[PDB]
């Protein structure tokens, strides 16, 4: 069996990698943050309740100016809100009514969407004529789209259900580099602050850090018991947090290349749907299937508060660029802004 | 400048509200259906009679709008994209008549899924012609795969369709109770299953899904008033 001998030597390197990771873990983060004073109880009330969507909200993305946001639901409707005054700006009908993602360009000119059509539809908001229409339909993915994020007006990174991620070119419509290596559906991704790198969490209970330019996976992070539903980079850009179905939120380190902390409770048994950090990274906000959002101290693993205002499970959570507010959209077609 | 900017914003919001309300009437009028098979189970015939990962099909029956969505080219793993189909009226399950055992496992995993607890499953026992000729020819057998069939007896309430072999009548109903065994074992009443012995050539499958959809709505309305 010439195939078997390859596995025997391959697992030795995996064993060697395991030994290296444990050697670098001289001391855990719990002892290094034992003397830090706790943040204490925090009160956060829903300042605004954005309503108007018909079907369940599946994703949302804050604007780069901390004012507008785009929310996509399962009725084929894209709504752009104004969080300050709660007035809709646009209502874009969708070709396919089974989208699971949306995005806001850093220039505020484009909005993308994708879902159970393997096609990432991109709309332009600053058209010369006046009405919002699809500018370019990016096709080439095999599985359903799960999360698409913008780099600039000419580049976009999309993660599909065919265990691959892509880096598209807007004008040409052809993907430049295709990222391979995942064994299961890719559910979420988050760009680094410098945009050089990005990680993606798939259904293999593993997160893989990719390189945007050369299209090669540098490091692989594992340790989760079940699949990963959402992921988010640390504000510093040298860490990220993953939300999984097995009801654990984990914090990883790029430089350490291993686990740092786990956020879990015996009471909590449902999976995590969305994870995001705060402005300073001290506060971690995680969504759950029990209709509640739990606020986790990212340095002490102790819950600081609970954001419970939704009648159904949350499927999207996002914190503004300046950290002034957090918007959590749930399956009850309601978006709430907490402050 | 606060007064000038707000004036245009209100008109846009009011105009969008009018357009959104109009589309809300249409969305609530149509009934969404999910056509799902066991893989090469003959479901292609149902969609035809009436690039892209989901095919959209709309047909008009008795002044009622239906919307059947068949998922094509998506990966075999349905554990992630099946949570979207938790607001559809029903799932039009098509089961080929091994292939039979794998059909039951997917149906059991759909019935017990937390999201698709409420959603009802319309079940079609298509490809019955091959099943009818399988027992008659004797080349292929099912009691070897399903040992309960030898001891199994024809149900009393079964209606004999004239011109059919009484032996194959037992085989057809045996699959129905095998699918109904899981449906009734873990059934809290929030959802139901409607087995149907359909064919690959009859055009009456449209009528069957029309009556079954009305049955679901009648039960849903009754339990909304706590009558049932």
């Amino acid at each position, epitope marked *: 069996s010439e195939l078997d001998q390859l596995r025997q030597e391959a697992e030795q390197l995996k064993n060697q990698i395991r030994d290296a990771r444990k050697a670098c873990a001289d001391a855990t983060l719990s002892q290094i943050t034992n003397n830090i004073d706790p943040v204490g109880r925090i009160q956060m009330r829903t300042r605004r309740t954005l309503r108007g969507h018909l079907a369940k909200i599946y994703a949302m993305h804050w604007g780069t100016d901390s004012r507008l946001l785009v929310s996509a639901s399962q009725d084929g409707k894209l709504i752009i809100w104004d969080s300050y005054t709660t007035n809709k700006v646009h209502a874009i009908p969708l070709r396919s009514s089974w989208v699971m993602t949306c995005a806001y360009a850093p220039s505020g000119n484009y909005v993308a969407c994708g879902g159970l059509d393997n096609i990432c539809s991109i709309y332009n908001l600053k058209t010369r004529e006046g009405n919002v229409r699809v500018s370019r339909e990016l096709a080439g993915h095999t599985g359903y789209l799960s999360c698409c994020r913008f780099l600039d007006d000419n580049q976009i990174v999309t993660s599909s259900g065919d265990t691959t991620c892509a880096l598209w070119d807007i004008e040409t419509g052809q993907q430049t580099t295709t990222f391979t290596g995942h064994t*299961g559906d890719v559910m979420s991704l988050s760009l680094a602050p410098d945009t050089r790198l990005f990680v993606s969490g798939a259904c293999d*209970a*593993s997160a893989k850090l990719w390189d945007v330019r050369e299209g090669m996976c540098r490091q692989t992070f594992t340790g989760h018991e079940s699949d990963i539903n959402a992921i988010c980079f640390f504000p510093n850009g040298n860490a990220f947090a993953t939300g999984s179905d*097995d009801a654990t939120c984990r914090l990883f380190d790029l430089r350490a290349d291993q686990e740092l902390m786990t956020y879990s409770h015996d009471n909590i048994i449902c999976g995590i749907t969305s994870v995001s950090f705060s402005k300073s990274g001290r506060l971690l906000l995680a969504g759950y299937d029990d209709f509640n959002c739990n606020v986790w101290d990212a340095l002490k693993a102790d819950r600081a508060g609970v954001l419970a205002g939704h009648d159904n499970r949350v499927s999207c959570l996002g914190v503004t660029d300046d950290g002034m507010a957090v918007a959590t959209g749930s399956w009850d077609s309601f978006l709430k802004i907490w402050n | 400048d606060q007064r000038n900017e707000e004036k245009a914003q209100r008109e846009a919001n009011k105009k969008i509200e009018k357009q959104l309300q109009k589309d809300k009437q249409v969305y609530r009028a149509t009934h969404r259906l999910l056509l799902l098979g066991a893989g090469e189970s003959g479901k292609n015939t149902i969609v035809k009679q009436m690039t892209s990962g989901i095919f959209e099909t709309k047909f008009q029956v008795d002044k009622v709008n239906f919307h059947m969505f068949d998922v094509g080219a998506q990966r075999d793993e349905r554990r992630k994209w*099946i949570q979207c189909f938790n607001d559809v009226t029903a799932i039009i399950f098509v089961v080929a008549s*091994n292939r039979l055992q*794998a059909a039951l496992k997917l149906f059991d995993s759909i019935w017990n899924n937390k999201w698709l607890r409420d959603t009802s499953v319309i079940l079609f026992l298509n490809k019955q012609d091959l099943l009818a000729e399988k027992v008659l020819a004797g080349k292929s057998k099912i009691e070897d*795969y399903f040992p309960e069939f030898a001891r199994y007896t024809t149900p009393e309430d079964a209606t004999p369709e004239p011109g059919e072999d009484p032996r194959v009548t037992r085989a057809k109903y045996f699959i129905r109770d095998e699918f109904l065994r899981i449906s009734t074992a873990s059934g809290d009443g929030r959802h139901y299953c409607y087995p149907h012995f359909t064919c690959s050539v009859d055009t009456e499958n449209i009528r069957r899904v029309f009556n079954d959809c009305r049955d679901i709505i009648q039960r849903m309305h009754l339990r909304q008033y706590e009558l049932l």
Partner: nanobody
Amino acid sequence: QVQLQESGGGLVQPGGSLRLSCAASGFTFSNYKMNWVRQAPGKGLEWVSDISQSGASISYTGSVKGRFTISRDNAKNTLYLQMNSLKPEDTAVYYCARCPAPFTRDCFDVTSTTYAYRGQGTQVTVSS
């Protein structure tokens, strides 16, 4: 990183009793449903049996109810499959599968062609 390497298997005479022990690591075993899946030569994946988290609810495929018995031990996180009265028809490679989510009754994609939480099967041969 979950990985399931199971022992047992190999060439055996017809009717020769064998046991298939599945070793689990990387995840807690007390709250995950377990399954057994075989791959017949020239055919697709087939489902054999499953056991609930508590070990009470046990279900088998049609052809192995009178031949196979299964057990699960949570103290040593090992899953066992017992083979009795084998025939040349059922020869295949047996994979020890795991249920994608905990604290749930449904189980999806166990028999899927590409599954992340599935071990490397051991080929068993029953012939004379």
